[PDB]
Amino acid sequence: RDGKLAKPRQLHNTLWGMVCPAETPEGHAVGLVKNLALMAYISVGSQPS
Amino acid sequence: SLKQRLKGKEGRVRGNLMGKRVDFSARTVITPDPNLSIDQVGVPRSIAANMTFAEIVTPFNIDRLQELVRRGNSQYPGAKYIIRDNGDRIDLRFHP
Amino acid sequence: GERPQANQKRITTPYMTKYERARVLGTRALQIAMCAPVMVELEGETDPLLIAMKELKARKIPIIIRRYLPDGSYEDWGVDELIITD
Amino acid sequence: IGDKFASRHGQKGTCGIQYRQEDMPFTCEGITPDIIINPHAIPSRMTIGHLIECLQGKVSANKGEIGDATPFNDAVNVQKISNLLSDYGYHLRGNEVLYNGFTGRKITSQIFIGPTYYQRLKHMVDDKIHSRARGPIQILNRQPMEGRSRDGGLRFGEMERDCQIAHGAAQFLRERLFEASDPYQVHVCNLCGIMA
Amino acid sequence: QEKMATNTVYVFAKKDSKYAYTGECRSCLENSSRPTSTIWVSMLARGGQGAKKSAIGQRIVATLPYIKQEVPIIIVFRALGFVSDRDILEHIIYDFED
Amino acid sequence: TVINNWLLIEGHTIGIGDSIADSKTYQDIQNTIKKAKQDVIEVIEKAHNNELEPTPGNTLRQTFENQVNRILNDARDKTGSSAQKSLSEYNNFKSMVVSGAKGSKINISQVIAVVGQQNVEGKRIPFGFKHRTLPHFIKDDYGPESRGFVENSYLAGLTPTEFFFHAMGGREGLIDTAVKTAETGYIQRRLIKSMESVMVKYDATVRNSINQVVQLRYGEDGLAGESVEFQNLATLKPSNKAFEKKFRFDYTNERALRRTLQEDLVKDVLSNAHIQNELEREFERMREDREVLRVIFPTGDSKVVLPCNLLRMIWNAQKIFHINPRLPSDLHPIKVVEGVKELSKKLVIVNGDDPLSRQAQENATLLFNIHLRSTLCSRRMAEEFRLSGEAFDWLLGEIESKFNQAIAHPGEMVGALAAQSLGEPATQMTLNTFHYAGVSAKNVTLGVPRLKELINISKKPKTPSLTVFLLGQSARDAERAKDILCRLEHTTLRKVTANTAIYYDPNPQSTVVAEDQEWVNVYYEMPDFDVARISPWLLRVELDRKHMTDRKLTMEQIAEKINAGFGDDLNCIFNDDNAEKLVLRIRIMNSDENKMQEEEEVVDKMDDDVFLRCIESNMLTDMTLQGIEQISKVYMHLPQTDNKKKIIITEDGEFKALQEWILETDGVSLMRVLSEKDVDPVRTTSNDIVEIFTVLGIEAVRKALERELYHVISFDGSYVNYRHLALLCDTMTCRGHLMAITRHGVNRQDTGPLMKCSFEETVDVLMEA
Amino acid sequence: MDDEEETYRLWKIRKTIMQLCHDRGYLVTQDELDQTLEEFKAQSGDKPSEGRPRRTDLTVLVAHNDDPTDQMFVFFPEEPKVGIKTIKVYCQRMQEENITRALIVVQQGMTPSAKQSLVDMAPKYILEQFLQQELLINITEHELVPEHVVMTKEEVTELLARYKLRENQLPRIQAGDPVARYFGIKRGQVVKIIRPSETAGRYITYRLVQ
Amino acid sequence: FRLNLSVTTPYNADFDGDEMNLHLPQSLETRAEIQELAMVPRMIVTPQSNRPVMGIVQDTLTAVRKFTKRDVFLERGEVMNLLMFLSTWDGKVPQPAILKPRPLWTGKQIFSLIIPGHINCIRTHSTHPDDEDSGPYKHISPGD
Amino acid sequence: KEAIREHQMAKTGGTQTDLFTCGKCKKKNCTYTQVQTRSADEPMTTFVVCNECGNRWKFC
Amino acid sequence: EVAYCSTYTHCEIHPSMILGVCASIIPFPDHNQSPRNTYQSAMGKQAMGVYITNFHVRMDTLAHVLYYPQKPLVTTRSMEYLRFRELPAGINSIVAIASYTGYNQEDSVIMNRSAVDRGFFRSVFYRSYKEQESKKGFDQEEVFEKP
Ligand SMILES: [Mg+2]
Ligand SMILES: [Mg+2]
Ligand SMILES: [Zn+2]
């Protein structure tokens, strides 16, 4: 939405270990739909006080 | 309103003139069969139990056409509906 | 007389096309199905698609092909004057 | 026959045909196969992993132990696994010969037999069908209903009408738009063309 | 869903229109209301006037929030209590010996 | 059915045993890859030592990525050739490749030997993880296993560092497939809304929906396309000596019982001067169709497509009548000549009365008449084929029967056929890895955005191109060919200037610069009478010497251009190109009359401090030495031997290649390029369409647009008939103006009222009508 | 520039305008059509010094055609921007000489007050307007330009009275085509086009000038 | 929808689940029009690229080159079984290519029974081993 | 003059594998083209287009 | 002995951690083609098989269970923690690669009629309906009766 016109997705180097590369739908939503790796923790937020 | 129904945004153009629905059709799942001929297409038994075809009654084969009418609508080799000359569309299922 | 000009000079080769073969086989099959006198001699068949096909090879179908020209005129053609292509 | 299936390796395949046990080939003791897949479906998509499960399942069946399928191991799944299969009394490459189920002649080639785990998709072949001769017709435009949920007709896309022009069938296209679809007639005056 | 990391100054390439560079950077609150507040600092790509200054390519005129047109960024330093070029240059870089 | 039933009793399976190579061969496969790794390290070791010679045409980093491309390509092709000989014919895996299915030589190495490089969008794997690709590798490591290349195959597994790289290539072909699939329903839908107007009528001439003659006959021959077969003309003979010996033959043969066998009728017409004139004039007509053939086919390709294959119809008659060289065949000489003239009279498809209609029939079937006369010649029917009189009589009745069936059926709705003839090859692989290299760059966009833009016909294309040809000495010499490059290239003045500084020079004769003191002092012939009240602020510029040797420029051509741009009120001076650097000082020309507060006027015209800043920023952009502004400055040479162009004739008659020096630009200014010297204005074409209608006209758009669409199909791999490429150009260029035939340009057309409303307007059109 | 290289520009535009008239139907001598660069500076003494009306001596008057008309005065102006003063003088030389057609070539452009009288001028008179930027090179020598042959009145009437080809059925073309301006065609005439075909050999088509 | 493999090639469809529609005419004049126009015995060679669309690949391609292999020699009981499998047959058993000792047949004699005795196709072969020209041109060695 | 002369010699590429033999000029000036990966029902084939004399054919 | 660098700070837990839920089901994902591995995640999601334990308390419109949920033989140790061997999606059918009669062309297989009669992938179509008995106005409402 916020940014278009000639902006492909393809594959990025930071996807290693964080997002499963071989897990995407076969329809028109390929590449746009992301997932999560097997062993990965999501940050929840903390106070750096 | 009145313009949207005819402009083309799913109105009387794209949704009717450029995209309507017809009758007498079938759409299943294709399966490979090299043993058949180049024109022998697959026809299911459940689909054939509904696809009808209005055939005129000719005196050259009036005996064969009468056999399908006498048997009724109880099996495949039979007739379902009939149409007379004036327009009488008589059914054979609930016929006395 | 101001439009039909088939009795003077004809430009199209006298040969039946694939479009005219479909209409002749379709129109004749509808007439025979409505109890019509058979032009040829019947040998024992009831298929309306086969009766019109047998009469096409015998060139005995009394029909005249009226090919409308795009300029406004039209030309006439007969069954004997058109050789079928298979 | 006709239902949509799939596989664990990615080579999905619907139910083509089903024969009896006597009409299918067999090995020596009487091992009749359950699913026959196209041998040409492997080089067309480079599905080499499908042959690994078909060979690993045979070695684990003769031993009786759940073999690990780690894709990053050092056990060498090429020579060590092949040599272990030949010790039980079979071929080391996993290839076996079968017999003809109709005449009894030995097969020239070697059928690579072995167990393979599959799945089953949710695509009923008897639920996706849609056929009707003459049923309920709408009143807004005198057209069939939506689909099978309300007993209607099939979709007529624009690509079907565009290609029909290339065939030159004017009478067949008129039937799908006027005759066998929306049959109606309107009386038109002679002095004027206003439909009233 | 997924969004871009806020409170981080990033440099992008925007050479499709009359601009050349774009420094998009958000400024959302921690846990209060976070009204987005995206700081748009772009660099134009125009070059050549005629007879006035003939140095429009060295301008910045960033797009401050709410603001209609583009205003220069050096005017904001005059409102922050710094009216000398020695103090403004100190905010940019801590070593002006280059 | 018989083949399918035999497969049950035979069998053809596949497994692990069908993917094992030789034991001694597999040892050499892994050793060959290790030898290629030492060659890559040798290039890296020689690159960091500052001693490697870059490739002329690129930089240093662009050369390293090119040198390693041929190393890894030869490494994956040498190991694949060794695995081809190891697999025997008994292996069922090779039978799938030899038969011709979804598998070739590259599919064998990717599962046994080595996969290869997994490039992305043509280019190699970029850096997006702190100048790296994966954290498993160290910084500044240009290894092959860390840049997408997979050293293993689908048999011994893949390393974790290579499994992530190989997965990127599969995602490129999967995401683009879903995007290209959605474009099929939008491009094909647009073509059928405008091409459905034209159709084939009954009077040969192709018309439309509003009764307008578009063409004179379908396919420029009045024949169908189903009977067209890839034939072989076999007329463009290199050596003219063999062309006369093959066709022409005289009766002055050896006395050794010649002209007595095979044909038992030659003995009756021995030494006949009446029949000699008929055979001598026949060869004269063959020579007329040969010299003009060079102009009709300047490319030199006799293998074209024509209906009614004469190579099979003549040979088929030899089997029925049992024709063999060991049998005398009596052939009549006059019957062969009369048979061609009699058969040519039956080829009339239009009116036949006035002499003007006969001129439109010979040229319409000119290619078919030459192919029929050359094949059914007087000697070809008696030496290569050796046909008798009965074999030639029945052959004339068979060609006329097949020609009648090859005639296009009048009434074929070509409106829907021509629209699908272009959208069908577009669904193949138009935009999928720019494989077109040709020792050049990635010029000329080819793919999905090219077809969507050519139909919409915009004002300026995305990537314009214009190939420039040369003749004279430039077609064989490299020094004269590069001399024109200096005039055509848009050399900006900013690139020439290396440095610019503002100095304070009070006395112009005694400057403060020590290294440039004697240069401005020895020059005394300059009228230094009005230089005492000029601008004291000095604006000295510096010219780069490395740029002079790369573009070939002088010092006398720079000062004569600066003073001719701003005006006469601008002084310029320079020094010779033999000192330490190229400098150039500029001053003003003060009239010394009324340029010193003559009329006061508290407005201030222009301050001296800011006067030099405006000129310094206006000369480095607006002022151009030489070249066109709208042609960029990129250039690249293409091999003339590669493409089939320039086929000249010699004293012998053979077709040889003529190499020269060609270049390509990046502009559409066709009027200024053709106006240059030495450049040949005959074969100079371009990919633009708008400038063709302005410079040349609509008569050249039909010929230029057809060649652009033919180059797309020639590279995609598919094929398109010639009768459909000429119809698309004639349909759009029918009104005499380059206008979009789609929705963007329909109000200006003169079509029916019920047709313009079908473009998603309806109400907007019916209200006007 | 404007020294020695300018001689090749004046020599190239002279060979182009001579082939423009010979392609229509005029007869030009072989010596005038076939010449070299050194021969152009010897027919009447070219470039004696610097600064001279070089565009005035280029006045030619051909008069060789089958149609007994001939007399076509061709003159080149001297000033770049041809104003209304030059048009009033150029129109006086054609009244005393009583020519048939004119051919003027303006360097840059003209004035709006003079471009209106150039098209109208007189109902029984036709004046041609060219340009130096388009006559420096011959656009008819390109490989994508077919053979263009003009037609007469009797050839158009006979063609439309054969296949019953109506006037609206024939394709149209605009007046902005430089090909139509190369021969000076008028609105309402058919121009024969000879296009070399590939799968045929020679394709012939006809178009109407709208 | 059981169909032949030769029909799936022009449609370029897959049997994985790609649904295909099948209409039904309700007129006598329309059945004769489709039978003489929109049919697969007639729509073989397309005018778009003067080449046929019928393709014979996958399973119906490997068994063709293997049946004509030099290492194929059918027995006597397998010839009569394949003769009955023919849809049409005049009723003339061909002469065996090998008379002694055992009456056997070659791998190309049975395949030649389907092709009529008045059509041929040479020159075009498109192989893979051996060598592209040069080789077979030496001493004129046709075949294989 | 020798530095700018060698600029139009190597260009940006090379190709020319020198394997296939052309049947029109008894020379081996042919190149390869890795085209057709999956396609549809059409089998993949490495197209061979000869540089000189203008020749091209199919590998299968 | 042979190492270009010896300054490592972190290390991966297991090379198979890059896969996901459906990606860890296919054995040896490296030996197969890279785009073909992405189709498995779309097939395993829209497939049949058991998913929980209590089958009599759930009433979903789309529910398919298996009579004999047999665990796969050749499996990975990564799916042991994801609870996959207890709730599979099929059985270990013996698949023999063969041509048979050429009826398994283009994404199709040939099965045994006698094997299906014994319990080869026998599922039950569970579909639940619901009808709300709401009001229809002031004095208008629905009444469950038997007219
Ligand atoms: Mg498909
Ligand atoms: Mg398929
Ligand atoms: Zn060659």
From Swiss-Prot, chain C:
Gene Ontology MF terms: DNA binding; DNA-directed RNA polymerase activity
Keywords of this protein's UniProt record, alphabetized?
Acetylation, DNA-directed RNA polymerase, Nucleus, Phosphoprotein, Transcription
* Primary location class: nucleus
Q: Which GO terms describe its cellular component?
A: cytosol; fibrillar center; nucleoplasm; nucleus; RNA polymerase I complex; RNA polymerase II, core complex; RNA polymerase III complex
Asked if the Swiss-Prot or TrEMBL record annotates the protein with the keyword Phosphoprotein, the reply is yes
Name its cellular compartments: Nucleus; Nucleus, Nucleolus
Name any Gene Ontology BP term. tRNA transcription by RNA polymerase III
- What does this protein do, in the record's words? DNA-dependent RNA polymerase catalyzes the transcription of DNA into RNA using the four ribonucleoside triphosphates as substrates. Common component of RNA polymerases I, II, and III which synthesize ribosomal RNA precursors, mRNA precursors and many functional non-coding RNAs, and small RNAs, such as 5S rRNA and tRNAs, respectively. Pol II is the central component of the basal RNA polymerase II transcription machinery. Pols are composed of mobile elements that move relative to each other.
Q: Which family does it belong to?
A: Belongs to the archaeal Rpo6/eukaryotic RPB6 RNA polymerase subunit family.
The protein here is known as: DNA-directed RNA polymerases I, II, and III subunit RPABC2
Q: What is the lineage of its organism?
A: Eukaryota, Metazoa, Chordata, Craniata, Vertebrata
| Gene encoding the protein | POLR2F
**Which residues of the whole protein are included?**
42 to 127 of 127
Curated annotation (Swiss-Prot), chain G:
Q: Which residues are annotated as modified residue N-acetylmethionine in the UniProt record?
A: M1
Record localization: Nucleus; Nucleus, Nucleolus
Q: Name one GO cellular component term.
A: RNA polymerase I complex
Q: Does the keyword Acetylation apply?
A: yes
Record-linked Pfam families: RNA_pol_Rpb5_C, RNA_pol_Rpb5_N
Which key words tag this protein in UniProt? Acetylation, DNA-directed RNA polymerase, Host-virus interaction, Isopeptide bond, Nucleus, Transcription, Ubl conjugation
Any GO MF annotation of the entry:
DNA-directed RNA polymerase activity
Where does it mainly reside? nucleus
Q: Which domain of life is it from?
A: Eukaryota
GO biological process terms, alphabetically, are:
protein stabilization; transcription by RNA polymerase II; transcription elongation by RNA polymerase I; tRNA transcription by RNA polymerase III
The answer, when asked if Nucleus is one of the entry's keywords, is yes
Q: Where is this cross-link: Glycyl lysine isopeptide (Lys-Gly) (interchain with G-Cter in SUMO2)?
A: K81
How does this chain assemble?
Component of the RNA polymerase I (Pol I), RNA polymerase II (Pol II) and RNA polymerase III (Pol III) complexes consisting of at least 13, 12 and 17 subunits, respectively. Pol I complex consists of a ten-subunit catalytic core composed of POLR1A/RPA1, POLR1B/RPA2, POLR1C/RPAC1, POLR1D/RPAC2, POLR1H/RPA12, POLR2E/RPABC1, POLR2F/RPABC2, POLR2H/RPABC3, POLR2K/RPABC4 and POLR2L/RPABC5; a mobile stalk subunit POLR1F/RPA43 protruding from the core and additional subunits homologous to general transcription factors POLR1E/RPA49 and POLR1G/RPA34. (Microbial infection) Interacts with HBV protein X.
HAMAP family this protein is in? RNApol_Rpo5_RPB5
Which family, according to UniProt? Belongs to the archaeal Rpo5/eukaryotic RPB5 RNA polymerase subunit family.
Supply the name of the protein.
Answer: DNA-directed RNA polymerases I, II, and III subunit RPABC1
Q: Which organism is it from?
A: Homo sapiens (Human)
Swiss-Prot record, chain H:
> Subunit details for this protein?
Component of the RNA polymerase II (Pol II) core complex consisting of 12 subunits: a ten-subunit catalytic core composed of POLR2A/RPB1, POLR2B/RPB2, POLR2C/RPB3, POLR2I/RPB9, POLR2J/RPB11, POLR2E/RPABC1, POLR2F/RPABC2, POLR2H/RPABC3, POLR2K/RPABC4 and POLR2L/RPABC5 and a mobile stalk composed of two subunits POLR2D/RPB4 and POLR2G/RPB7, protruding from the core and functioning primarily in transcription initiation. Part of Pol II(G) complex, in which Pol II core associates with an additional subunit POLR2M; unlike conventional Pol II, Pol II(G) functions as a transcriptional repressor.
Source species of the chain: Homo sapiens (Human)
Task: Tell me the residue numbers annotated for binding Mg(2+) 2.
Answer: D14, D16
Family assignment from sequence similarity: Belongs to the RNA polymerase beta' chain family.
- Domain free text: The C-terminal domain (CTD) serves as a platform for assembly of factors that regulate transcription initiation, elongation, termination and mRNA processing.
Where along this sequence does the record place binding of RNA?
D18
Residues the record lists as binding Mg(2+) 1: N12, D14, D16, D18
UniProt name for this protein: DNA-directed RNA polymerase II subunit RPB1
**Where located?**
Nucleus; Cytoplasm; Chromosome
Gene name of this polypeptide: POLR2A
At the top level of its lineage, which domain of life is listed? Eukaryota
UniProtKB/Swiss-Prot annotation, chain J:
Give disulfide pairs as residue numbers: none
Q: Which residues bind RNA?
A: Q46
Q: Where, subcellularly, is it found?
A: Nucleus
Binding of Mg(2+), residues: D107
In the record, which residues are listed under signal peptide? none
Subunit comment: Component of the RNA polymerase II (Pol II) core complex consisting of 12 subunits: a ten-subunit catalytic core composed of POLR2A/RPB1, POLR2B/RPB2, POLR2C/RPB3, POLR2I/RPB9, POLR2J/RPB11, POLR2E/RPABC1, POLR2F/RPABC2, POLR2H/RPABC3, POLR2K/RPABC4 and POLR2L/RPABC5 and a mobile stalk composed of two subunits POLR2D/RPB4 and POLR2G/RPB7, protruding from the core and functioning primarily in transcription initiation. Part of Pol II(G) complex, in which Pol II core associates with an additional subunit POLR2M; unlike conventional Pol II, Pol II(G) functions as a transcriptional repressor.
UniProt lists the family membership as follows: Belongs to the RNA polymerase beta chain family.
Name of the protein described by the UniProt record: DNA-directed RNA polymerase II subunit RPB2
Originating gene:
POLR2B
Specify first residue, last residue and whole-protein length for the fragment.
686 to 832 of 1174
